[PDB]
Symmetry: C4
Subunit: 136 residues, 4 copies
């Protein structure tokens, strides 16, 4: 799960230098610094005035910015979906299906100890009986 | 799961030509092209200034646009809910309940091999014994 | 699950007449009609300019409107959470844990048919043997 | 699950007095009272004009407010994720994996009653047979 939290903080990083490279020119409030894009893209990630506030006016200057915003939201919120699910799995198979996946791993092999002793008891009886057809 | 990703990209398409047909007239910034609606509806799908920015002013010109926006959000975000769930199911029954659904499919039939051999051993003993009530 | 889709469409209704009763006076664009509140509250439920657009200006006229908006969002989005979960449960215990809850209900009782026949075979052997201690 | 609903309503509280302490000075509409921050932070938690509306203008006065907003959203929406998951777990292991975790706790021990009676029957037979090699 936390092996993707690295990936997310890489995409966040990659796209922050992208926007600083592109829009630092004409949108210096949103993309002037690296640290200003780190904020803007967080705001863009949270989908609060992402388009009407940021994307639309940025797309007005460069139409090659349309994809930068769309692709960012697509990849960003998608690797959160992979991350949100990475907690539902690691949580529902840890508190429920990791304790049951061992209690039924034990209750199954606690009757292989029952069946395989009982088997021996029947063989110890096949030995006592088949030695009495050779004795009568 | 990805059999609905086609459906979503059909609803996205269907509604994009709808808005271009309707609003290309008076809202050319948002619905002028097919490609402008493809953007606007993505923005409307992400619920960022969807109403106050897009729907409200569009509903001011045509009140028959109220339903276009509401219905779009309802169907769109609903087939994402069907898609979001389509990953939680295909993920929690693949990494947990597809490996366990085979290890308990094997552990169950590894004792039918135990019970049905043991049965034979008892019949081989019923054969040795019921041939000794006919021998005494 | 769909037994709460009724409840949600009741809260939606209840609060729509509430807002039309209260704010139809001074906010006639948002709450003038029943059908205008049905839209506004849908927009409020989707959390798009819910506060800065609707609540804040409505709270400026009446401070007894603060709770109307907060309580609405709390109850509304909470019975969606009960509804969103009502599909995750009804879907993950239907496609996975309703077919397995019957295949293991059958595989369990397919060996009670094995154990209880084998038992009889041993009793049919206790009958053949304990009638040979009375015969020797 | 509801043991974190207390924690959330503590973070909500902690950060509300924080913002009233800091921003009551120059942003009295958003942070003037304790009760105004309780609203603003709810609006900030719902990510509706959180940055462009609240954070950005507040960051314009104090750049030491950037972290207050980011950290709030991070911790707040994260302990909702822990809370949202705390219902998926407590619901999917209660309606499905708490009734099955008892029906298979009973079906397992209803055949230990079978195997351990059958064992006795074989021993009662080893007693009858091994007393007939000492009798012939």
């Amino acid at each position: 799960i936390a092996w993707i939290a690295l990936l997310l903080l890489v995409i966040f990083y990659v796209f922050a230098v992208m926007g600083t490279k592109l829009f630092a020119q004409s949108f210096p409030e949103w993309f002037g610094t690296l640290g200003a894009s780190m904020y803007t893209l967080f705001q863009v990630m949270t989908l609060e005035s992402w388009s009407m506030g940021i994307a639309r006016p940025v797309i007005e200057a460069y139409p090659w910015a349309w994809i930068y915003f769309v692709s960012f939201i697509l990849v960003s919120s998608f690797t959160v979906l992979n991350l949100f699910i990475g907690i539902i799995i690691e949580s529902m198979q840890s508190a429920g299906w990791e304790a049951e996946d061992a209690k039924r791993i034990e209750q199954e092999q606690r009757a292989h100890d029952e069946r395989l002793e009982m088997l021996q008891l029947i063989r110890d009886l096949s030995s006592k009986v088949d030695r009495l057809e050779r004795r009568s």
